Design a protein around this ligand. Structure first.
Ligand SMILES: Nc1ncnc2c1ncn2[C@@H]1O[C@H](COP(=O)(O)OP(=O)(O)OP(=O)(O)O)[C@@H](O)[C@H]1O
Ligand SMILES: Nc1ncnc2c1ncn2[C@@H]1O[C@H](COP(=O)(O)OP(=O)(O)O)[C@@H](O)[C@H]1O
Ligand SMILES: Nc1ncnc2c1ncn2[C@@H]1O[C@H](COP(=O)(O)OP(=O)(O)O)[C@@H](O)[C@H]1O
Lengths: 370, 24, 66, 370, 370
């Protein structure tokens, strides 16, 4: 039957969820499963083995965090099943899995097997009435109130650029590169090892994520700023320690614009955006340059878009008006857009029937993938 | 706005439109 | 009584048992009620939570209805 | 109907489960008289145990059976256990399960021979061996914190966060109360009061328990004690003799904070707790600095929480809430915790039945200790 | 200068030194400072109070062992200055610390301030004409004559794997975990404390090291041998006391393959090597699996190579010729390679001249060292 549908954004690091017709995701919690790595002696301790949810951040000094989704592709399927059940848990949604149409998102160009296996989970473990899997870009266009644009996002693990012109998506112009937030944080962790801090545990890694979200900032000209010393921010650990970052506060998010630093022949995020535009036709290049829509949490770096303008302006043709729109709700654009598309009747004319899935299987979702 | 406060991370005090100047 | 009146009385009975007992479990899991249990154990009233659950049958009733 | 016996290197606090204060409180001492060719007549025992040897201490030789938490003489410890069961509690151990308290990082031979004796000699149905710090945390009414236990033969620190222990951040130090007794005996000999034999050791430890306090600023207190003389108090021996002690009062527990006075080449109790905190995870150190729990009889010195708080304050960062928990019932914290644990509704599955020892043997203790 | 440089293998356990162009380091002494803990009374006693070299080993009971280099990082600059001066004194080399170039080895991925302050010492306290800090892996390859190969070493305190394919060191595949010989020795001390034989003096920890180096065999089957029972062979202390080792002899060196035992999540030695090979490219891992070069003293255990073959065969893909190639002068391989590098005509081009450091400073050091 069709009750109020549920939108779930499988952000490779932060999963965002809520019902359709809403206006904000009230269920935002990081994506992992934390199991304890210590010994239990005192009866009356914490509860349960796995610790998905806010309890993880509340007791991170005990857990051994494991990420289920690496680069948008799920590795530990059992963890994603536990996370999805936690989304339907009594602390997050309280509904039953056999009650709502599910609007699952997905990073573009993910392997076929990922969609297939997600279908198996949602129609065998959960017995959902309906399911639809879509691109993350289209949703951001819904949440940004537009129809034409190039959604250049940066989730926690996959950055990509999808150029959509007047609601028509151009698949051959999609550029995907697997270097996002986790790689920025991982590279920053390596820099702190060279600064003498040796963060190597799992909880230490999420402390690095907190640093990346708070102390880093992007460059404008990394040589102008490389020849001069900087602020050297003093971040305080929860323990009470004191860490200094130095020039790595701007060298850490340089990995996005240049994967040569991490030792990887790939393209910058600017090259992804510019190529994604240029892989398309010629009559549309000017309009796509005039409508660049960001989303994704790894575009929230301070001083990011200004460097993006200097970069694309350095690459795009002469005097073309490059116009980047970056809203405040970039972190939830895919969720808000999922709510917008799921709050329609075309959505009823757009999902995949449970019966039809049982009759067909993988071929059903690969036909209705767009 | 409260709707963009209640959430954990939001670009507070940042220009929303990045665009090249005039003088084409 | 399992033989009292109509069968819908049994249906609504067990159904409302699940709903009411779960709401009671939610009341127990509230932060202030758990703060009361924490203050009782911290004030050295050792078997506070033990006597709070054992004296009742919330676990047994929830298991039976579920 | 459980028995809680706290066998330390000094006192042997024993009693029934559920009780607040233990019934049996006596120094675990055995003593053979001066074996001479002469006779005695009209009867006397062969080896006085408990308060018997404490009152007849004028001629018998005090021999502790436990040295630094290690049972060095199983026959003397068996005599103390037989005295406890059949004479202080006045109940056979076959009708009740017993609960023993051992120190952490204890050599496996003690943890196994203790079980072998409790099953083969007394025919007990169930016995469990718990770590004294865990029980101190139970009696402190908290499931999160670090226990700075200090007995007469052992002193250890065990951090437990949310009921889970950290078996690697557990330290242990042999610098405990008996070493303080020896140090006070040596400096009292230096002031002109030779307390040579073991019978005089109870008198010097009585001096330690009555007129010894922890100095806040040891150098300032030592300079004022060498300058003024109002700090010098008096004390009466069992004889009509009266003594005066000036430095000894505050200089006796100074070895706990400064192990260099005994040539231990180790860290004081404050930095032992500090290092035990630093060996934990960086996300749970706030709770450890707030829930620092003192226990054991060696923490009964007047004005010791101030010294611990000042030393840790100087060591821990400025933004930490250093809080020392020192209850007035910390002399029986291990026994009180044993009472709480033995009276729990969950602990019945945590025992070690007789048939389990009949099947496995002494090796089941390591898989059932903690 | 028209003289010969000094190749200092600044390890953490044995600071090996000697002139360049030699074949065996003529001066191998441990990396610790010995300060007496007792009080000299009788005249004619030993003087200086800072014993380094064979003087500290000849009289361990007098002095307190203090290591200056903890996990490859210098923690006591005063002690390292004294050890360096001890190298340049008449008891070790008789030359001047201002008339020879210095080849200073260093573990990879160390903090920047170590290189900075190390060259600050050698160019401010000592006024060396030229200093060239270098990797240990490159030097080991220099000594073996090979050019390819994955250098998997394990010194006293730092384990690391630096894959190099014909002189092109990949600076991103380098893995490094601080779990080696000294930490294994400390874990062994903990095991011996669990066995009943306690050692707590600093001058006694080296006796523990001797126990580590004499009877500690790595078993091929970890749990299959863990469930069994050995014959418990004995050992003879320098005192003359006999100690039954027990199961610690095989459960203590497993820390190099299971760092969870110490209570720290990280990878084992085999996972370090396998991940260092897998972080490289596709067209290079076959030669790297066929070219594995060992080094470091912690790889001298009984059955270490056999267990590496078993673990690597469990992780490497099927039908890949694995070849572990270790040398015979394993403890001196890095120094021999340092001798070969410093004895080259091209070595004058790659150092840091004194005038260069006076002109720039730290930037020149980081510019010329890997
Ligand atoms: N008021 C006091 N001030 C200082 N020290 C005291 C005081 N009362 C007792 N002590 C010391 O405390 C020690 C008591 O040991 P404790 O009560 O800890 O028992 P135990 O045998 O050490 O076993 P456990 O550590 O498990 O309790 C004795 O050595 C005694 O000298
Ligand atoms: N204020 C911030 N500054 C920099 N990076 C941020 C900030 N907030 C979030 N991020 C990055 O965004 C990531 C969140 O990933 P996200 O974009 O939510 O994935 P998805 O969008 O697919 O859910 C975080 O891991 C973090 O690295
Ligand atoms: N036979 C052995 N078994 C185990 N460990 C050994 C053996 N021989 C030496 N070691 C350890 O190897 C270490 C020396 O390794 P080495 O690579 O020389 O370290 P460094 O490079 O810091 O000098 C010593 O600490 C010693 O503990």
């Amino acid at each position: 039957i069709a009750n109020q549908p549920v939108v779930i954004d499988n952000g490779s690091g932060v999963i965002k969820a809520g019902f359709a017709g809403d206006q904000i995701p009230k269920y935002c919690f990081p994506n992992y499963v934390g199991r304890p790595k210590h010994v239990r002696v005192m009866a009356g301790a914490l509860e349960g083995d796995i610790f998905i949810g806010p309890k993880a951040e509340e007791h991170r000094g005990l857990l051994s965090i494991r990420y289920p989704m690496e680069h948008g592709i799920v590795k530990d399927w059992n963890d994603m099943e536990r996370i999805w059940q936690y989304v339907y848990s009594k602390d997050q949604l309280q509904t039953f899995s056999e009650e709502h149409p599910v609007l699952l998102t997905e990073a573009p160009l993910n392997p076929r097997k990922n969609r297939e296996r997600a279908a198996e989970v949602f129609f065998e473990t959960f017995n959902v009435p309906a399911l639809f899997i879509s691109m993350q870009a289209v949703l951001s266009l819904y949440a940004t109130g537009r129809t034409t644009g190039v959604v250049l996002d940066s989730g926690d693990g996959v950055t990509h650029a999808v150029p959509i012109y007047e609601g028509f998506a151009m698949p051959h112009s999609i550029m995907r590169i697997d270097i996002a937030g986790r790689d920025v944080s991982r590279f920053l962790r390596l820099y702190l090892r060279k600064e003498g801090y040796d963060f190597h545990s799992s909880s230490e890694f999420e402390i690095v994520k907190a640093i990346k979200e708070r102390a880093c900032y992007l460059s404008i000209n990394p040589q102008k700023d490389e020849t001069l010393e900087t602020e050297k921010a003093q971040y305080y650990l929860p323990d009470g320690s004191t860490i200094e970052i130095g020039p790595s506060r701007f060298r850490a998010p340089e990995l996005l614009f240049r994967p040569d630093l991490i030792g990887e022949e790939s393209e910058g995020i600017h090259e992804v955006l510019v190529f994604a535009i240029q892989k398309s036709d010629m009559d549309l290049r000017r309009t796509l340059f005039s409508n660049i829509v960001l989303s994704g949490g790894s575009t929230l770096f301070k001083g990011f878009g200004d460097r993006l303008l200097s970069e694309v302006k350095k690459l795009a043709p002469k005097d073309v008006k490059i116009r980047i729109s970056a809203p405040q709700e970039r972190l939830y654009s895919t969720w808000i857009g999922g709510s917008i598309l799921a709050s329609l009747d075309t959505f009823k004319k757009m999902w995949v029937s449970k019966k039809e899935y049982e009759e067909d299987g993988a071929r059903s979702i690969h036909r209705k993938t767009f | 706005d409260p709707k963009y406060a209640d959430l954990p991370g939001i670009a507070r005090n940042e220009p929303d439109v990045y665009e090249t100047s005039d003088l084409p | 009584d399992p033989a009292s009146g109509t069968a819908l009385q049994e249906i609504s009975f067990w159904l409302n048992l699940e709903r009411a007992l779960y709401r009671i479990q939610e009341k127990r899991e509230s932060p202030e009620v758990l703060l009361t249990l924490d203050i009782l154990k911290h004030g050295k009233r050792f078997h506070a939570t033990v006597s709070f659950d054992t004296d009742t049958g919330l676990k047994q009733a929830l298991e039976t209805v579920n | 109907a459980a028995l809680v016996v706290d066998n330390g290197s000094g006192m042997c606090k024993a009693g029934f489960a559920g009780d607040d204060a233990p019934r049996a409180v006596f120094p675990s001492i055995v003593g053979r008289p001066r074996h001479q060719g002469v006779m005695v007549g009209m009867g006397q025992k062969d080896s006085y145990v408990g308060d018997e040897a404490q009152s007849k201490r004028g001629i018998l030789t005090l021999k502790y059976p436990i040295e630094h938490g290690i049972v060095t003489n199983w026959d003397d410890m068996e005599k103390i256990w037989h005295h406890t069961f059949y004479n202080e509690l006045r109940v056979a151990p076959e009708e009740h399960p017993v609960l023993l308290t051992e120190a952490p990082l204890n050599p496996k031979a003690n943890r196994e021979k203790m079980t072998q004796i409790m099953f083969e000699t007394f025919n007990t149905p169930a016995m469990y061996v718990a770590i004294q710090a865990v029980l101190s945390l139970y009696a402190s009414g908290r499931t999160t914190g670090i226990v700075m236990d200090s007995g007469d033969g052992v002193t250890h620190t065990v951090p437990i966060y949310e009921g889970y222990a950290l078996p690697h951040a557990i330290l242990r130090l042999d610098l405990a109360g008996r070493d303080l007794t020896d140090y006070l005996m040596k400096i009292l000999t230096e002031r002109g009061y030779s307390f040579t034999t073991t019978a005089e050791r109870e008198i010097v430890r009585d001096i330690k328990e009555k007129l010894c306090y922890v100095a806040l600023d040891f150098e300032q207190e030592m300079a004022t004690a060498a300058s003024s003389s109002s700090l010098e108090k008096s004390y009466e021996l069992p004889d009509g003799q009266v003594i005066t002690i000036g430095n000894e009062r505050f200089r006796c527990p100074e070895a706990l904070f400064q192990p260099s006075f005994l040539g231990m080449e180790s860290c004081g109790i404050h930095e032992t707790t500090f290092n035990s905190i630093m060996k934990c995870d960086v996300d749970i150190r706030k709770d450890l600095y707030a829930n620092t729990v003192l226990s054991g009889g060696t923490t009964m010195y007047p004005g010791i929480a101030d010294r611990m708080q000042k030393e840790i304050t100087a060591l821990a960062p400025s933004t930490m809430k250093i809080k020392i928990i020192a209850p007035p019932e910390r002399k029986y914290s291990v026994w009180i915790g044993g009472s709480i644990l033995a009276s729990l509704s969950t602990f019945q599955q945590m025992w070690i039945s007789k048939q389990e020892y009949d099947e496995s043997g002494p090796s089941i203790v390591h898989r059932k200790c903690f």
